[PDB]
Design a protein around this nucleic acid. Structure first.
Ligand SMILES: [Zn+2]
Ligand SMILES: [Zn+2]
Ligand SMILES: [Zn+2]
Ligand SMILES: [Zn+2]
Lengths: 71, 73
DNA sequence: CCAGAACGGAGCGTTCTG
DNA sequence: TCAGAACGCTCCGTTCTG
């Protein structure tokens, strides 16, 4: 039902994890040509439908912790 | 010399406060439109040149705390 | 010197396709 | 089934104008 990264409504299983479409292509973009991501808080940001744009570092970390892989 | 919002190099006294150009146009954009920004941390994000884009909520709060206002004469 | 507009780049999220 | 391309919107920061 819900994206395992940002809790938005999931569209399917993308890169081995149940995610939404926005998290799908975010993860693809993050893995290619790393993007100089730095958290402004404590490496523990809240990632939800709105707040996910705030911290790509924490978003990317959550993607990996959920087990996203390009295969 | 240093922007009181993000500590980047200041470009002048803008909206009443010593700030850089980016914080100048950010504050103007924030006050004249919606500023319903949400912090994903604990409302104490580090705002500097590298991270000021991460949290508009905390950047706007630092603008207000430093005293920025549109009608600074 | 400063306010405001404008321009171009980056990041993001959707739609579309096979 | 889902991976990928591509378009357009938003946000940003520098340069330009008044
Ligand atoms: Zn998601
Ligand atoms: Zn974070
Ligand atoms: Zn600044
Ligand atoms: Zn914040």
């Amino acid at each position: 039902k819900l994206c395992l990264v940002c809790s938005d409504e999931a569209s399917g299983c993308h890169y081995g994890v149940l995610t939404c479409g926005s998290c799908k292509v975010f993860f693809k973009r993050a893995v290619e040509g790393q993007h100089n991501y730095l958290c402004a808080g404590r490496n523990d940001c809240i990632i939800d439908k709105i707040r996910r744009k705030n911290c790509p570092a924490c978003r990317y970390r959550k993607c990996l912790q959920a087990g996203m892989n390009l295969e």
